[PDB]
Design a protein around this ligand. Structure first.
Ligand code: HEM
Ligand code: HEM
Ligand code: HEM
Lengths: 727, 309, 727, 83
């Protein structure tokens, strides 16, 4: 008589299975066959549990884990209860400091491989051979919110990849936009305080829609470019799988001859680009604040590995000055029209972690963890970052020995004369702890730099100037990049940007700030400032109306790479559809629905007014995954409503609103047979409407129209029609 | 030419004003006249800012706070930039561990006074004289969610009062229900792990609606009473002002002769009892997750002092 | 061309070799063959160094480890120097908090085994089978001084043994005396502050000879018993090998039927008992403050394993009250005359650690780490200790996860639901982190208590009383134990005790304290108080002279087990002798000296006025280990001066004083041939003198007389004669 | 940060400056100072940018580094003049 169910339904299948199918589970039990050298190196610190006795941390078996030791069944607890003291103590000290920023984050394991050797341009060992597989750990994140904030907030996303290479750890620590907010790291804390909750009262959580953030923006137009991206649909992604990733700074590649090439790094999503819309995103933070962390986890269990393609923008040394902005200014993007992104290799994220604290929470990414073959530039934001990511570990992860924490451990050799941290794991046997040393024949030894397996050596850049605290004049341009961004966007994308600003700005309490931000917008584009100013109830003045727009960027009038939806590359594999059930589903409808979806890798969740089962018209038993309220349209890409006893749900508030919300958020909707009577609620015509798939029954045609709407991600053409619906 | 608006609309009135009326503000600038012995004792560690020079933590005035010191307007940052190192360092180490539980919480200052001497039943100095005013600090909280989780979750609320008495600090550390989940503290961590996010993936945040929590419940019926309260509208209050508070345990009062009387403590809301409904509460976590922290803050600025008996 | 010497004389032999013979070395390189399950379990965290590249902690090879990265061979250091930042950072954070007490300490690995199964009296698995070998780690220590204080101070010694058993870690955390200073742990900090340096100025280091300590003593006569031991030669041991060890508290043994037997634990030194004398000890703290740590290290490299025999005093439950002091009072000893010590097993300390910080500094001993088969009693000092040793780790070793630090890791299984410390090493795969849990079928499971491999369960002692803060009346006796101690001591031992008090008391500045301590001594023994009071220039009053001595202890007038030297058990194996060389040593003298010594395991160090070599009369080349000043008589057990060119050293200040100091500290001295002319300096007669071995040459007879003096440890009979010598 | 437990070590009594010290640095471990500034960043309009930068000057000025000319490449090399 043990407490597990007799039929074994406590324990999930060790098999790729869809979202909702099984309980979720630590990667090593859900996917024991997936391996790589990092994950196998972790074996020495994994701990199982089955068929083991419960014990104190010192090895003692425990007989009663239900009670304190007391003088009598009703007496005081005694101080000699060391079992209770240890158990409580450990609990008492469970928590460690959250990250200063990107505290909220979700990770996975995986690997990378280059498409071709890159030894022409860099000696980076991990890029030397397309047969060389490099294990990676990746953590995606928000920026502002605490470790327990929501996933779908309007924020920048972080995208950090730790490469466990054969010649050291390389950390690629990037974001989901190609620029940053600020130019010099010295104002880092200023900006971060400005967007972080306000100090007197700790409000708002994971939001920029407050007074101080915009106050800052309005006084530092350097921020405006990235603020643009934030306000766009870019700042509210569908999935960590459906965003682009950027290294932001220009770095250097260095080859075996010592030739430097400037580079900026990119991650390009094989899943394509896709993002939510605001109302959907905002309300989803309430309905499932773990939406991204969840979707990532499930996508992986489900076999839908997130894949990204590592690409380089490369710029030769003698081109440093050909662009009319500065390559070292991190608030400027390099348009792909001027420098295209060359795909170099690919990363696959193919297994979840076992313990979220152990592996995610404690991981330490730092951009200055580079390897031979790479080097820095004078980007004055990058310069700063170098300092901070080592420092902060000392209090986050408790000391200098954070590289000994399992997930952070290199997978190549590491030896030196560094001794003695807090929580030191390694026990050095070297008779010497210094060099030069004769007593251990100077081991371990320096290694001269070389083609492969060499010492690190910095590129010998010429430095000429005086010791000054002064912004480069070449950084003094703020508007042409925002403008470029804005004119690259589709019309509906621009409505969103407008509504983005209007919403945020409307929660700035001190109205003079609203005006000052509008004033900034005037310098970027007058359409934009008009639309926003209308929505805030502001009249642009004559002065403002006449403001000259900034120059084209190097003669560019737009760059299609900056739009999410310019050239849809939306991909349905991994997406999810809601199927609204009634007690009497027409089975051959449903057969055809699930069969079609399954063929293109699209997941379904069957929903009803309650849990349990319903039966088909042919007596197939249909298990319910959640109720209408339990799994709102927010959480799905489309809604399908098959035929049957429509009378069952026809007057159900929740089923109707499921459709109304779905419609307002521009999602595809498919109604078979009598389900078409739901058109009434969505105030649709009897003639039909684009984006509403309809028919006597679900067939070849019905499903294909639907899936094709899905390849378009959203039904943009619906926008004009949604303001009348009240959802 | 400074950056404040000419008409002075950056700076809030030092006056009781309604929610939305003014920008919110630190108590000592919004309500400088409100005092008590705790708040005045804090004077030695308060720091103002107006008409002061921006400096390093060591006292040095800063001339340019917009730049790292580099070799040339376009060169590398130098290690001799101690102004930048201190500024970043302090930022680097800003965060301290969140609470194991009740990490998400909202506070205020205030005071207490007894209606009548209680020396018949207890020698507690703070209850000895209805003229004795005791400064308090109170923190209300959720239980499960992190310090950056939502306010209007379906959880237990904490209700902690620090009394700064004349014969020592008395902490009254209670909840918004009159019982607890478990019987012996030895299973504390077990239950808390059961309701806290699941260890493999850190899901769900400030929710009990997951497998492990109910698994535990189902195997330990001792929990059922408090689980009842949680499931009721009690677990989704309107306002920290509109819930009851409980010490839960039976304690003792001890008087000057040494007579013990058993006691259980209560806070009764002069605002009365009021709670949201689920759909409203759940969606409100999305629309304004700082709803309680906000409402408390504003109610206070607004002169609507939360009072409890 | 590497920096090691061509002949390989940088690298020590992997062979048992005497003190001075070889450079010392990490256990795993000096004694690679010595093993045990703990030491082999450490393999996964050891790090070698030969034939490895020097790297950053992240794996990157370093090419130049001699320079910061600067703008120009003469420019500023750049913030992008991550190699320098990591290297300095790690150094910057090297140090962790020292122990509150016993901060100064020296350790080694080893093992224990029982002489016979003990299952009659306890189910302690480690005592179940004499074939069961249990790895141990032992740390000896002082109490008061910081981690960088001297070894040979007049203090209590700690003696802590961690047993890595098959059913959990058992920590035996004892001292070198059988009682403590205080009765209730609540006054722990008071006493420790009293003896620790004074708070205004941090003086004195590792000494009790100051105002506050004696002030405390004088006001809390509970301390007097242990203070007695401290003042005796017990408080200044020769070697960690030559002291007794005590668990102090009465504990319980619990067998398979649940029968409790009270027990007190002992370690009995197979090396026997031996201690220095004050002047020698005090001056040795200056000449070699690492004397004990060194002697231990070398003794081990040298094959002279320290061995101790674990013995129990056992007292049946129904005897609790037969003694006229309380078994639970930790300031009372159980005389071996009333309860003898039964030898139970043996421990061998047979290998040094590899890294002192890794293994010694970070180890965590805690007396409440017990196992099934053992349990506590209500000793109110013990009760306290239980609380403190878990707590203090949280800040010393940085968190709750200190059991994961390699040396502290159990060697049996350990599994539970404890999650997430700072610096968490273990990665839990259990789908559950709580119990009862159905989702992992409640694993790991509680284990009901049983004969072997059972859960821990406390002995179900009856508790009856009210919640009070009151010392037991049965503890209210302070003097009879001191008295017992004192009357067990030999006359010369008592001079030492007297001089102990007189010395300490003389550095108490406020004389009223001196008087009050004298007053306490009056209640113990009047001889003693007279002698001390004379030396402080105090006249005992009539009142004081008449004070009635305390009762015998259970009719005892002495107990020989309390004397160091009552029954000499002094053992020469491992001891060291100084041989004073001249440029023309008579080789057949020396041959015979070293040959004799070697036969009984006694080490020699050859000394001279300078380093290098001298040559024998037969042209054998004699390497010098240190100069006369370099290795003072303090550091050796005896002095031998062979024949030869005595003229060479005869007028040498240092060689003469070597002998004078040696003589004043009662050491054996042996002079052959013309070396007898040195008798002049030691103001010895021409007739001879006991303790000075002399002859025409070193032969069978000469050596044996010397070694026999050594088996007596010191020449006590010399005491009356030493006050005339001025050394 | 590890010896004295955090970034706020300047608040430890002996280390406390005796002149004024004000900035936008917030929140260490063991934070003693309670900042009342409505703002924790600059530029800020909501507290009229206080506390303010101070231009360098004869006395009571901002700190400014001596504008030494730097000319050389990024090398890890001991100056020959030190040999
Ligand atoms: C170039 C723009 C930047 C990008 C793309 C960026 C990226 C990130 C990301 C993605 C994280 C989360 C890392 C994780 O998952 O562990 C992060 C954390 C951090 N960042 Fe930023 N960051 C940027 C600017 C800065 C600046 C200017 C500073 C300080 C000057 C800074 C200091 C930190 C620190 C101290 C942490 C986390 C604490 C730690 O992981 O040790 N970063 N950075
Ligand atoms: C009787 C039921 C309980 C009530 C009414 C209760 C109340 C609370 C409240 C309201 C907080 C938040 C305090 C704040 O605002 O700072 C809290 C925190 C805490 N509680 Fe619970 N609690 C209960 C049970 C427990 C148990 C069984 C344990 C451990 C055995 C525990 C240990 C903690 C710790 C360690 C903290 C916060 C860390 C700290 O403030 O130092 N409490 N308690
Ligand atoms: C019964 C008399 C005592 C004996 C035989 C004794 C033995 C020792 C020894 C030998 C050490 C050094 C441990 C090592 O090498 O790591 C020690 C450390 C310590 N002792 Fe004492 N002790 C005694 C009394 C106390 C009392 C009364 C307390 C507190 C109430 C105390 C608390 C500590 C702490 C907190 C440490 C070291 C910090 C740590 O190792 O975690 N001990 N004890």
């Amino acid at each position: 008589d043990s407490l597990a169910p007799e039929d074994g339904s406590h324990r999930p299948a060790a098999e790729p299975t869809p979202p909702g199918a099984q309980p979720t589970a630590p990667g090593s039990l859900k996917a024991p066959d997936t391996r790589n050298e990092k994950l196998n190196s972790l074996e020495d610190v994994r701990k199982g549990s089955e068929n083991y006795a419960l014990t104190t941390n010192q090895g003692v078996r425990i007989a009663d884990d239900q009670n304190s030791l007391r003088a009598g069944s009703r007496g005081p607890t005694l101080l000699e209860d060391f079992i209770l003291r240890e158990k409580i103590t450990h609990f008492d000290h469970e928590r460690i400091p959250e990250r200063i920023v990107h505290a909220r984050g979700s990770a996975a394991h995986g690997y990378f491989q280059p498409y071709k050797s890159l030894s022409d341009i860099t000696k980076a060992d991990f890029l030397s051979d397309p047969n060389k597989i490099t294990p990676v750990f990746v953590r995606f994140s928000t920026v502002q919110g605490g470790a327990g904030s929501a996933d779908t907030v309007r924020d920048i996303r972080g995208f950090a990849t730790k490469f466990y290479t054969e010649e050291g750890i390389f950390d690629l620590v990037g974001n989901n936009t190609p620029i940053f907010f600020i130019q010099d790291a010295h104002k880092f804390p200023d900006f971060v305080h400005a967007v972080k909750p306000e100090p007197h009262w700790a409000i708002p959580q994971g939001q920029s829609a407050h007074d101080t953030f915009w106050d800052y923006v309005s006084l530092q137009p350097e921020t405006l470019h990235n603020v643009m991206w934030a306000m766009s649909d870019r700042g509210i992604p569908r999935s960590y799988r459906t965003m682009e990733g950027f290294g932001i700074h220009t770095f250097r590649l260095i080859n075996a001859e010592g030739k430097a090439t400037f580079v900026r790094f990119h991650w390009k999503p094989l899943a394509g680009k896709a993002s939510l819309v605001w109302d959907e995103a905002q309300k989803l933070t309430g309905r499932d604040p773990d939406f991204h962390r969840r979707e990532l986890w499930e996508a992986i269990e489900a076999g839908d590995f997130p894949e990204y393609e590592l690409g380089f923008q490369l710029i030769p040394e003698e081109d440093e000055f050909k662009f009319d902005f500065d390559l070292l200014d991190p608030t400027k993007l390099i348009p792909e029209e001027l420098v295209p992104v060359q795909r170099v290799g690919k990363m696959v994220l193919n297994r979840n972690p076992d313990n979220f604290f152990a592996e995610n929470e404690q991981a330490a990414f730092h951009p200055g963890h580079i390897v031979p073959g790479l080097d820095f530039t004078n980007d004055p934001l990058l310069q700063g970052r170098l300092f901070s990511y080592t420092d902060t570990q000392i209090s986050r992860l408790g000391g200098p020995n954070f590289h000994e924490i399992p997930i952070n451990r290199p997978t190549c050799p590491y030896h030196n004369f560094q001794r003695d941290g807090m929580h030191r794991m390694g026990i050095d046997t070297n008779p010497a702890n210094y060099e030069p040393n004769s007593i251990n024949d100077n081991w371990p030894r320096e290694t001269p730099p070389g083609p492969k397996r060499g010492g690190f050596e910095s590129y010998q850049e010429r430095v000429e100037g005086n010791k000054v605290r002064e912004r480069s004049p070449s950084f003094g341009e703020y508007y042409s990049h925002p403008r470029l961004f804005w004119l690259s966007q589709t019309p509906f994308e621009q409505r969103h940007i407008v509504d983005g600003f209007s919403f945020e700005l409307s929660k700035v309490v001190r109205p003079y700030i609203r005006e000052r931000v509008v004033d900034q917008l005037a310098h970027i584009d007058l359409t934009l400032a008009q639309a926003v100013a209308k929505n805030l109830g502001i009249e642009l003045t004559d002065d403002q109306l006449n403001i000259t727009p900034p120059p084209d960027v190097n003669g560019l009038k737009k760059d299609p790479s900056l739009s999410l939806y310019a050239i849809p590359d939306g991909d349905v594999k991994g997406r999810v559809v809601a199927i609204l059930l009634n007690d009497e589903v027409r089975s051959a409808d449903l057969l055809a629905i699930l069969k079609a979806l399954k063929a293109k890798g699209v997941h379904a969740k069957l929903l009803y007014s309650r849990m349990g089962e319903v039966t088909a018209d042919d007596g197939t038993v249909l298990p319910i995954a959640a109720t209408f309220a339990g799994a709102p349209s927010l959480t799905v890409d489309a809604v399908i409503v098959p035929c049957g006893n429509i009378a069952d749900i026809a007057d159900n508030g929740d089923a109707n609103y499921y459709l109304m919300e779905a419609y307002k958020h521009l999602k595809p909707i498919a109604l078979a047979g009598d389900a078409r009577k739901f058109k009434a609620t969505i105030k649709i015509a009897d003639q039909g409407e684009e984006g509403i798939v309809e028919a006597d029954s679900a067939d070849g045609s019905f499903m294909d129209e639907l899936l094709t709407l899905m390849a378009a991600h959203r039904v943009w053409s619906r926008i004009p029609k949604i303001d009348k619906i009240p959802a």
